[PDB]
Amino acid sequence: LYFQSMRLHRRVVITGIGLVTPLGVGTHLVWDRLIGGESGIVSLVGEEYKSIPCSVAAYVPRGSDEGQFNEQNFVSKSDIKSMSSPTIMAIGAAELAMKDSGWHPQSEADQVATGVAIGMGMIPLEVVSETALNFQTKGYNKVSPFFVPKILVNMAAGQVSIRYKLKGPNHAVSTACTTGAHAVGDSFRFIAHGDADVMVAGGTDSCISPLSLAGFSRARALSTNSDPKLACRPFHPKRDGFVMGEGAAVLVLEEYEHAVQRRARIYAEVLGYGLSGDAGHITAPDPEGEGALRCMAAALKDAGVQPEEISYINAHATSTPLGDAAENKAIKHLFKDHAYALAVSSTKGATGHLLGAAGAVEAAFTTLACYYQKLPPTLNLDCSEPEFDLNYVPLKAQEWKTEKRFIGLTNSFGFGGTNATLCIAGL
Template sequence: MEKRRVVITGLGAVTPMGNDTKSLWKNVVAGKSGIDFVTKVDKDEFPTKIAAEVKDFDPTHYMEKKDARKMDPFTQYAVASSKMAVEDAKLTIDDSNAHRVGVWIGSGIGGMSTWEDQHEKYLNKGARRVSPFFVPMMIPDMAAGQVSIQLGAKGINSCTVTACASGANSIGDAFKSVQRGDVDYIIAGGTEAPISNMSFAGFSSAKALSTAEDPQKASRPFDKERDGFVMGEGAGILVLETLETALERGAHIYGEIVGYGATGDAYHITAPAEHGEGAARAMQHALDDAGINPNEIDYINAHGTSTALNDKYETEAIKTVLGDHAQNVSISSTKSMMGHLLGAAGGVEAIISVKSIEDGIIPPTINYENPDPDCDLDYVPNEARKQDVNVVVSNSFGFGGHNVALVFKKYE
C-alpha cells in the first residue's frame, strides 16, 4: 500500500511563553524565559519554588463558561489550542468530512488539580459531595474527547499516555493514522496542567526538580551546573492532513511530517537507559521511516530536560546515530525557556520545530554558561541562529522508558 504524504496546516498553543503560536515563537526566538516563582502552590511548602505557569488564560474566549466549568485546565488548554489550530488551518468541519477528521491528544497525568480538589471535598464533606463530573474531568483522554465534541470531529479519537513522551507519541500515532488512510485530517498534540501540590511533592521527593533560587536561570539544559527540570504546563496542537486535501483546499503548508520512531528502554522506571541506547534506536527508526540520511539533519529539538542523566545520554544518543555529523548539527532545548511541559512538551516542541523550518531560525538554549565535558555538541547557546532548515528531528522521552523521535521536513 502506498503511503500518503502528510503535511502540517494548522498550529495552536497555550504555553508559559504566550497563549498563541505567534507569541510563543516570538518569545522563543528572543530567548525569553517563561519561568518564575510558582503561584499555584504554596512555594514555602516545597524545596522547589519555581515553575513555568500559563498566564492570563481565559477559557471563555474559546468555550462557553458552563462547558469550561466541567473541564480540568489540561482539557481547557487542549480545547483552546485545538480551536486555534483548526482556525489557523482554515479547516471547516461539517457533515461532509466530520467522519474523516480525527483527534489524537496525549496527556501524561490528566486532571491533577481536579483530583486534589475532589479528594479534599471527599475527606472534609463526605462521598456525596464529590462532583459527578469528577471522573470525566480527571481522566487523561478527556482532552481528546472534549475537542471532538467541541469541534464535531467524528474520526478516530484517541489519547496516548506515555509520561513526558505523550505529546510526541500522539503526533506520531496520528501521523500514521493519516498516512495509512484511517482519516484525512487529524488534530494532534499534547496537553498538561500538572502544577499542583501532589505533583510538586512527588517530583520533589524524586529529586527531579531544580531547586535553583533564580527562576530565570533555573532551567539550564546541557550546562554543567544543571540540577533538575522546571515543571511547566500548557498545550501544543497541530492539524495534520494529507497533501492531497491540503492542495485541494489551498491550505498553507508549514511543513511535512515524514518520520516517527518509538522504542522502549526495558531498563528503569525513571532513569534513561545507559548511553541513551533506547533514545538512539528511536531516532534511527524515525530516520529509517523517513528515508532520511543522518547527515541531512539540520536541527535537533532536544528533549534536553536540564537533568544530569537525560542531557548526558541524549548527547550520546545523538553521537551514536549521527556519527561525525553530530559535531555539525545544531541542537537546542527550548525547555531552557519554558520548562518541561511533561505530556504537552512534544506538542509544543513540534510546533517550534515546524516554525524553525518555515522561518529558517533555530531557537537558542538559554542559560548555557558552563560547558560540560559529557555534553560537548553545538547547543546553540543563548542566542537564536539564522540558518536554512530543511530537516528537523524532535526528541521526547518519558518515565517508563518511552522514547520518541519525530522527523519534520520542508515541504517541496
C-alpha cells in the same frame, strides 16, 4: 509475498499550529518570544509551596492582555464546571490550530475525515483529592456527576471532538513526557494509512500544585535552584533537574493531496516516527542513551532519511545530569562526524517541561524551525563541559538556510523509559 502485503501510505503535512504555553498564547507571538530568548519560568509564590524544595515553575500567563490566556474566549462559565484545566487549555490550543489551518469541518464527510489525537500526561491531582475530601466528609451526594469526565485522560480529546464535530479517530495517549510526540506520531500514521484525512493532534498538561511538585521533587527530578532566570539550563555543567510547566499545544496534520486541493498553507511534512523503550529504570534514562539512539534511528528508517541529511535536532534535554548527557551521547553515536555539522537546541529553558504537552510544543517549534530555517536557542548555556561540544545554539537564535531540504528531528523521552522521535521536514 504471502507474508508481506503492500498498502497505500499517503504523505502527511502540518497546516495549523495552536499554542497555549508559559511563553504566551498565539503561534507567531510565542515563536517570536522563543527566538528572542525569552523564558516563562518564574518564582513560586504561595505559602502552599513552602514545604517543597522546588521554588520555580512555568505558568501560562492568564488575562486579557497580549499573549495571555483568557479561558472565556473559548469556554463558557458553565463548561468550566465540567472540565479540568488541561482540557480547557486543549480546547484553546485546538481552536487556534484549526483557525491557523483554516479547517472548519461542516459537512458530514469532512467531519468524519477529521479526528482528534490529544494526550494528557497526568490527570489533575487536585480534582481527585478535593472529590475524595468531599466524599469522605459530606458523602456520596457531594461527589460531582462530572467527576469522572473531569478526571479521564481522554476527555480533552473528547471535548475537542464534540465542540468541533470531529468524527474521525478519537485517540488519547498518556506516556508521561513522551505523550505529545506519540500523539503527533500516531496521528501521522493514522492519516498516512487512511484512517483519516485530518487530525487535530497534540498534548496538554496543567498539574502544577504543591502535591505534584512534591511528587516530582521526591523522585529527585526537579531543580532546587531558587533563581528562576537560572534554574533550567539544558546541557549546562550545573544542571540539576527540570522545571515544571503547564500548557497545551495542538497541530493540524493533514493529508498532502487534501492540503494541496483546498489550497492550505503547509508548514512542513512529517516524514517519520520512531519509538523505543530503555527497559532500564522507571525514572532515570539509559545512561549511554541507547534507547534514545534507537528511537532516533527508527524515525530515520521510517522517513527514509540518512543521518547526514539532518539539519536540526530539537532535544528533549530537560536540564538533568543523566538525561542531557545520555541524549548528547546518543546524537554523537548516531550522527558521528555529522553531529558537528548539524545544530541541536532544547527549548525547555523557555517553556519549562510541559509534561504531556512537551512533545507537541516541541514538534510545533521544530515545524516552525523547518519552515523558517531559523533555530531557537538553548537558554542559559553560558559554559560547557568538554563532552558537550556540539552546536547547542546557545543563547541566541541562528538562521540555518539551505538549498537542500531542511530536515529536523524532535526527541521526547519519559518516565518508564518510553522514547519517541519525530522527523519533520520543510517543503
